[PDB]
Design a protein around this ligand. Structure first.
Ligand SMILES: CCC(O)(CC)COc1ccc([Si](C)(C)c2ccc(OC[C@@H](O)CCC(=O)O)cc2)cc1
Lengths: 240, 11
């Protein structure tokens, strides 16, 4: 059974997600407009969406119990390394399996594989990305499990550049033990069937997606005309 | 490099 401490962790993470995820998508009007019908016509809009999402991921991470107690250098390392993965994870909430798209409230803000390719990305990323979204969606995670998985993703001690790896691991262990205990005592069978191992495998998949996205991001952002279309925060967090 | 925007969002 969940301890009071573990229940507090879950409550904090649910609150953190709800303060940083807007299921009305009301801010999307502020982004540069999507353009479809120009191999990069969607780059300005999707750069703004990604930048917006980085802000949300930072806001979520700062609420993870213990995260703000790490050194600021480790906080930065963890966020720089995990941000793209948490974006991929949190985007699953808008992903719909009926047409393999991210539906953010309106047709203008419904993104399919063509839209992602129109930000410069290729099938080498988009195909595993869609496969990941479908696989994650088919787990039918409780929101508790979803916010625990994002938190575990962020506080991973094996990220490159982490200095106090043992302190990071201590936070992740608290979160992992909370997730395992939640699955065992609150996820009804058979849905709990190897759910933890499957969620861990999703973290492995996100590492592979991270490497491919970074490879394509580095190639795209190396061209100054493309970097010009990004945002200051994207350049700072994803690299310049 | 420095990460002032990331750092400000962490405060
Ligand atoms: C150089 C181009 C570059 O590489 C970097 C600019 C492009 O990178 C990308 C990264 C990821 C994606 Si996407 C998995 C298709 C995605 C989908 C929905 C999102 O948001 C939905 C909700 O989570 C917001 C609601 C809220 O948070 O309130 C966010 C992202 C697309 C482009």
């Amino acid at each position: 059974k969940l301890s009071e401490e573990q229940q507090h962790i879950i409550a904090i993470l649910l609150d953190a997600h709800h303060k940083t995820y807007d299921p009305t998508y009301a801010d999307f009007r502020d982004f540069r407009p999507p353009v479809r019908m120009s191999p990069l016509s969607m780059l300005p809009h999707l750069a703004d969406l990604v930048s917006y999402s980085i802000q949300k991921v930072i806001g979520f991470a700062k609420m993870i119990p213990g995260f703000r107690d790490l050194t600021s250098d480790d906080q930065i390392v963890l966020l720089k390394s995990s941000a793209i993965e948490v974006i991929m994870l949190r985007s699953n909430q808008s992903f719909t399996m009926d047409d393999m798209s991210w539906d953010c409230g309106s047709q203008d803000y419904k993104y399919d594989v063509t839209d992602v390719s129109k930000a410069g990305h290729t099938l080498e990323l988009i195909e595993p990305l869609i496969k990941f979204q479908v696989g994650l969606k088919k787990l039918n995670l409780h929101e508790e499990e979803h916010v625990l998985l994002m938190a575990i993703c962020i506080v991973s001690p094996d990220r490159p550049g982490v200095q106090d790896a043992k302190l990071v691991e201590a936070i992740q262990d608290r979160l992992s033990n909370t997730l395992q205990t939640y699955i065992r005592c609150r996820h009804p069978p058979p849905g709990s069937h190897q759910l933890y191992a499957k969620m861990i495998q999703k973290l492995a998949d996100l590492r592979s997606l991270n490497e491919e996205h970074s490879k394509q991001y580095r190639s795209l952002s190396f061209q100054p005309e493309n970097s010009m279309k990004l945002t200051p925060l994207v350049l700072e967090v994803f690299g310049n | 490099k420095n990460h002032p925007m990331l750092m400000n969002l962490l405060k």
